[PDB]
Design a protein around this ligand. Sequence first.
Ligand SMILES: CC(C)C(=O)N1C[C@H](NC(=O)[C@@H]2C[C@H](F)CN2)C[C@@H]1C(=O)NCc1ccc(C#Cc2ccccc2)cc1
Ligand SMILES: [Zn+2]
Length: 299
Amino acid sequence: IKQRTLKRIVQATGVGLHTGKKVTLTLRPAPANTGVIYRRTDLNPPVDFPADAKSVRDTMLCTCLVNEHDVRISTVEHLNAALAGLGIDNIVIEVNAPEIPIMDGSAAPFVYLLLDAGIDELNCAKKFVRIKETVRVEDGDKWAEFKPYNGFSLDFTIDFNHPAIDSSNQRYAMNFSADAFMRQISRARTFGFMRDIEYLQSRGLCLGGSFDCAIVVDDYRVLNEDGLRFEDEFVRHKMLDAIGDLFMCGHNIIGAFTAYKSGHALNNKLLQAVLAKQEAWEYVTFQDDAELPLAFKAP
Ligand SMILES: CC(C)C(=O)N1C[C@H](NC(=O)[C@@H]2C[C@H](F)CN2)C[C@@H]1C(=O)NCc1ccc(C#Cc2ccccc2)cc1
Ligand SMILES: [Zn+2]
């Protein structure tokens, strides 16, 4: 019902999945109506990237923020999913490199870092995007849609034809809440095929890839010694990505998200399509937290 930021400043270091470059990440309290601001500090003067759906590029196997001249910060979807998780509206994210550190491949280390910084509630009203019409976008056999619904629901179906990713759980559905996100989604790691690593590293992608930040799968199985944190970790990670992608507008959404084989590109195309239709959505604030959907009760 009230907007949110951090109580104090926290730092973590790590490496960029794509660049291999060492990075330090600084999260910063920000006053009301600031929004979500990414900032590169390896550049002087430092360059600000406000989170906006029109500022997304989809080309580098992840979600990148870019300005009008294609200067960029890569691999924002995992930290962004953590901000969506804990309802954070106003924050400054500083990196001294062109990319967010990958940490353990999931959103959980971002969740711990934000909880250690404590959440500060503000005396100004948190704005929600309420979906007021069905919108649908497509790409081959891939599709993604939003529908009006008095909460926040995600229904995600993947189709990977691969023995190590059993069909039995290539679909996942949840009603969103900070606690659910934290218990069911936040610890789901990124993954990659051993068959792809030569190609991707020859192009300057996944240079920071390790068994520490990813599930590695060969032609038959998961190679990681300790296996999976969940039998369906693959589709939970795809849903983590989708939550990060939908928060590029900088507001939690009131709606029912459904997707088949969607990714960064189609998830942004959906988010954009919605915001381009004046009549498909509406801001809404909450005077009393009685009318506020259970999806957004504080953690
Ligand atoms: C199959 C593949 C085309 C795909 O469809 N998706 C969808 C998922 N994407 C995400 O999780 C996104 C992109 C970013 F990972 C953060 N969010 C996951 C996988 C993907 O691109 N993985 C990226 C990726 C690829 C490879 C290694 C290695 C590695 C490695 C490990 C050990 C030693 C050397 C190298 C990591 C990662
Ligand atoms: Zn991911």
